[PDB]
RNA sequence: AUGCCGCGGAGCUAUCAUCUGCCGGAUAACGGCUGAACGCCUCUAAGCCAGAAUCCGUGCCAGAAAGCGACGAUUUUUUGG
């Protein structure tokens, strides 16, 4: 199990920290999670476990997934498409904030502050579709999770989500 | 031993009269995200949000009489400093 390094992505290990770089920016999140020594040769990251336990076997795979998620997000998008199935649904807000309106006839207007690095384009190319863009899958999906979690039906049909993808 | 009666200012008093009585964080159950384990899946193992009249705070009351700070003047030509 060895994970390589792209042409231009500069991963640096500073006390279980990762600070990959790219044209999309710097994707750095704290990684105080893995108790496994990390070997970096400058082009490929190697994970070696010396007489580890079952938790070590979980740590190596989780670390590989996290670094794989970051290596996907160095310069590629994590666009998350939604679906507005329904009294109609309208979303009018600027910046990195998303507000709901006419949610099943409720007069209230739910307000959600998107996580940093998440861009909303309020696309009108396709019907009842809103996409969430970013480089960090964790932040993008957490923002999408918060958007859908606040859109819940109590004592009712319903509202569902759409697929994922990559942009740029 | 306030003789009795009507009204009676002031005071007191009446849910018999009038005025006033907020929002921040952390959570429980629970719901999600990135995600392994157990080559997949799954909220959980690390981590992150949301979330109760809950808990702790802001506000309100008292002020350690052995907690503290800033400021003011320092027995008058007798005397004390």
How is this structure best described in words?
The protein has 168 residues and is of the alpha+beta class. The chain is 20% helix and 24% strand. The chain is built from two helices and eleven strands; from the N terminus they run E-E-E-E-E-H-E-E-E-E-E-H-E. It has helices spanning 54-72, 137-150, and strands at 2-4, 17-22, 25-30, 38-40, 44-47, 80-82, 97-99, 111-113, 119-120, 131-133, 161-164. The strands form four sheets. The protein has a four-stranded antiparallel β-sheet, with helices on one face. Strands 1-5-4 form a three-stranded antiparallel β-sheet, covered by helices on one side. It is elongated. The chain binds one RNA strand of 81 nucleotides through residues 29-34, 54-55, 57-66, 69, 115, 136-146, 148-150, 152. The PDB classes it as ribosome. The entry lists the keywords Ribosome, Schizosaccharomyces pombe, protein synthesis, S. pombe. The entry is titled "Non-translating S. pombe ribosome".
